Amino acid sequence: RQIVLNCGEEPSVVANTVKGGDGNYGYNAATEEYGNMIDMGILDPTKVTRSALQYAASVAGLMITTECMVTDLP
């Protein structure tokens, strides 16, 4: 949604049509064509997409479960 937004296109619209597909069908923001992202040479190593996700999730749960915060006086 963010990539699309940064490009100045509609996120919801690009998002919906990417979801309408299967496999590695996607939107290439650089060229504005839909297709197979891998064929089109837009790929992330699996490690990195996963790691990003897991790490985002970790810190988010950590926060959702934080009840107290200690720090120095202003």
Is 28 labelled a binding residue? yes
In whole angstroms, what separates CA 23 from the centre of its chain?
A: 16
Q: Measure the CA–CA gap between 1 and 10, rounded to whole angstroms.
A: 8
Q: How far is CA 1 from CA 14, 23, 35, 43, 54, in A?
A: 8, 18, 17, 17, 19
Which listed residue (22, 46, 48, 71) binds a second copy by CB under 8 A? 71
Q: Measure the CA–CA gap between 46 and 14, rounded to whole angstroms.
A: 23
Is the CB of 22 or the CB of 54 nearer to a second copy? Answer: 54
Is the CB of 65 or the CB of 74 nearer to ligand ADP? Answer: 65
Which listed residue (41, 45, 46, 62) binds a second copy by CB under 8 A? 62
50 binds a second copy (CB under 8 A): no
* Partner that binds at residue 29, options a second copy, ligand ADP, none, CB closer than 5 to 8 Å by kind: ligand ADP
